[PDB]
Amino acid sequence: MASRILLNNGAKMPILGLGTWKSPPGQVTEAVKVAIDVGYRHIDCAHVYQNENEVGVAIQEKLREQVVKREELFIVSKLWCTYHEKGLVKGACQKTLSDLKLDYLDLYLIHWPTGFKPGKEFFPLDESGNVVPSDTNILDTWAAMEELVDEGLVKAIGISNFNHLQVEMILNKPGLKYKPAVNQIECHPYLTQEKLIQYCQSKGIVVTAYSPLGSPDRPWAKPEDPSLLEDPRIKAIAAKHNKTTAQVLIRFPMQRNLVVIPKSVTPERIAENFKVFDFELSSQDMTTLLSYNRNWRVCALLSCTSHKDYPFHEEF
Ligand SMILES: NC(=O)c1ccc[n+]([C@@H]2O[C@H](COP(=O)([O-])OP(=O)(O)OC[C@H]3O[C@@H](n4cnc5c(N)ncnc54)[C@H](OP(=O)(O)O)[C@@H]3O)[C@@H](O)[C@H]2O)c1
Ligand SMILES: O=C(O)Cn1ccc2ccc(F)cc21
Ligand SMILES: O=C(O)Cn1ccc2ccc(F)cc21
């Protein structure tokens, strides 16, 4: 299978990238260095992950040592919710660029459609446990993102965790200058996203699947939760193909024309997770994996369920 997908900005995006949420700062430099050595060319980052400086050390070492050229890398980051105000967007992007030791990002995403009150706290809460919103309209946040393209700080802009009506709002924005290149959403056999994926793809927006392995290290995991990596039905498909369960879970979105960003800090898993370009799931396998949907989310943003722009009340 081809390694990159063409975006609506004319650039090509590697379909497999390395995730970095929860990657400890003392381990993520090694993780990214190993990833680049074994073929990864796309790293998924975010300011809220609190490890971009350490990701940047790895990228810079591999650039300096001429393991890879900058034009061969595809580095993604995301604007956190407390920086939706138009006057804060550039500085937030520039902090990410400084930390990553880059002079541009390949893709910069609005991390969530929900804006929060600015300040030092990433999740400013009130006494009900609900987030303190900001009044900046997302269309205005989008215009600030467009300015980053025109200033050369980012090659492409996109969105994350936007539902179909929110994607539609941008696509219908008065005076829209750049369409979103990507919508990055949770997607795996327990949250298959047929409706939202079809909508985005029909508009030329590439979808990136996050938490493709079901995020077993998510901080709020409970014992009674389902577990993709331990699902015997998925293990059976993996065994039939002589691959690991994780490799099936990564190949699955690839065959839906999605980008996928599995996270690991374990060198052997980083290498294993990339060995997914040499086998094919059958149509029957694909339909069978789709049949496991249960609309089950790792990332439900539960402190924000009353925010006016909370994305997950709508069907898709
Ligand atoms: N836009 C958003 O709002 C958003 C939200 C969630 C995630 N994301 C992005 O998507 C990335 C991936 O999602 P995620 O981090 O939630 O979870 P994930 O990639 O589904 O799962 C990561 C977990 O799987 C383990 N793992 C990795 N490869 C494995 C293998 N071959 N066999 C067994 N276990 C394996 C990792 O362990 P080790 O690391 O210990 O090896 C870690 O515990 C994130 O890191 C982030 O970059 C974005
Ligand atoms: O936004 C993220 O990429 C990951 N994340 C970090 C904190 C957090 C909280 C809730 C959630 F639903 C996802 C979350
Ligand atoms: O908010 C949530 O979507 C899930 N969650 C549940 C407990 C918890 C704690 C911290 C956090 F950052 C997210 C959390």
Whole-number Å distance, alpha carbon 112 to ligand 2 midpoint, is 9
Ligand having the closest approach to the CA of 273? 1
Q: How far is the C-alpha of 83 from the C-alpha of 117, rounded, in Å?
A: 8
Q: Where are the chain's structural domains?
A: 2-316
Q: Closest Cα to residue 51, out of 204, 265, 225?
A: 265
The structure tokens 């880059």 sit at: 102
Q: Which residues contact 170 (CB under 8 A, 6 or more apart)?
A: 138, 139, 142, 159, 162, 176, 179, 180
Ligand 1 pocket residues where CB is under 6 Å: 19-22, 44, 111, 160-161, 184, 210-217, 229, 244, 246, 261-266, 269, 272-273, 298-299
Ligand 3 pocket residues where CB is under 6 Å: 219-220, 300-303
Q: What is the crossing angle of helices 52-64 and 86-100, to 10°?
A: 50
Q: Closest Cα to residue 10, out of 262, 179, 124?
A: 179
CB 263 within 8 A of CB 216: no
At 249, which helix (H) or strand (E)?
helix 245-254
Q: Return the sign of the alpha-carbon dihedral for residues 226, 228, 234, 235.
A: negative
Q: Which CATH architecture has domain 2-316?
A: Alpha-Beta Barrel (3.20)
Structure tokens, 72: 């061969």
53 in a labelled binding site: no
* Cβ(299) – ligand 2 distance below 6 Å: yes
- Identify the experimental approach: X-ray
Q: Return the sign of the alpha-carbon dihedral for residues 152, 49, 81, 206.
A: positive
113 in a labelled binding site: no
- Give the nearest ligand 2 atom to 122 CA: 7
C-alpha torsion angle, residues 146, 152, 155, 160 (rounded to 10)? -40
Q: How far is the C-alpha of 235 from the C-alpha of 289, rounded, in Å?
A: 11
Q: Closest Cα to residue 51, out of 73, 83, 88, 18?
A: 18
266 in a labelled binding site: yes
DSSP-derived letter for residue 154 is B
Structure tokens, 10: 């004319």
CB 89 within 8 A of CB 145: yes
Whole-number Å distance, alpha carbon 237 to ligand 2 midpoint, is 30
- Give the nearest ligand 1 atom to 217 CA: 43
111 in a labelled binding site: yes
CB 300 within 8 A of CB 312: yes
Catalytic residues: 49
Specify the residue with its C-alpha closest to ligand 1, atom 33: 246
